Write a protein that binds this ligand. Sequence first.
Ligand SMILES: Cc1ccccc1-c1ccc2nc(N)c(CCC(=O)NCCC(C)(C)C)cc2c1
Length: 361
Amino acid sequence: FVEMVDNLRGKSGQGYYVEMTVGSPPQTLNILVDTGSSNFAVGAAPHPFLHRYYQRQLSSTYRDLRKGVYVPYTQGKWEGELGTDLVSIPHGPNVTVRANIAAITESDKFFINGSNWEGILGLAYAEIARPDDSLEPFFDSLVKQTHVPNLFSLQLCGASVGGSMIIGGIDHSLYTGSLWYTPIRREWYYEVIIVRVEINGQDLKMDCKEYNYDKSIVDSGTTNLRLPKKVFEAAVKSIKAASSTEKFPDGFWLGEQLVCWQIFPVISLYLMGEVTNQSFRITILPQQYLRPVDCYKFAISQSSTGTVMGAVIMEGFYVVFDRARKRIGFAVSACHVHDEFRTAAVEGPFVTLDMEDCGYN
Ligand SMILES: Cc1ccccc1-c1ccc2nc(N)c(CCC(=O)NCCC(C)(C)C)cc2c1
């Protein structure tokens, strides 16, 4: 999978995108890689922020589904017109798939001014696709129509960002040590179960249900580590404690301020393993959750929809979305940023009882 190496670009905080083609003849677009959504949606109108857009009138293979779709978010939205067309990934597998495409015709606070992408590739499952789960997501269409294996893996290496999306396989050059797998609890988001959290080696001693209150997901579309409020409150209280050599205001912890200088504690997440009463832990450095924006912001925030393992987690690990076996693999990434005193790590096995009780119902 050599030519798929380094097929991801982007800017800090603006997500990772991959090059794709749509229609016949092929129209090239940069498309965000997003494991937290399930729609393949592309700009189709000359929005002033867009470098380019889907021009359906130029594609002989375009087919109109004659149905709109409306996707609101927190004060933002995009909406579009559903259709199908031929889709390829130039630095991916050598195949061409007919996939659903949502031609974005109206949006608000969706496209980013100054960014270099024009659409979004939802890699999650049909259940959270809009308008309903009958709109087959792209990767499902890819797997059904070709012999590409039902998995993909992501190495996000956080000016410009870089990374690799390996469609249908695993490139063992992109990680060190062994892969450790956590089960996909349910196929809608990429939902997983955190069973224990440690700050600098010290457990938070919270009922593990809180770590997954509502849910916990793996999301390449989210920048930060998003923890439930009560877990976030307890998490920052511990990170605050080990960080007494230097005192910042309270608002900096809620995402309100940056400071440069031109000692922090490591965060450990224990994930449910593949075997009863067996878990493993992934540990990230300060180089992950303190994102430069030599200045840096604090990239851990609270959430209402559960835990979100975003780029702060994924940029330290090679992550394997093993859809065929309903599991997610983690391994130390060969590109993660680390000093010479501490390293990102994936360790196991550990003994953890009542891991199923950690999931919310
Ligand atoms: C921010 C926003 C504004 C207008 C339209 C869409 C978006 C949007 C697009 C894709 C997203 N993809 C994501 N993975 C996320 C974060 C995770 C999340 O809440 N997913 C829920 C489902 C859905 C992504 C809203 C469809 C938020 C997103 C927000």
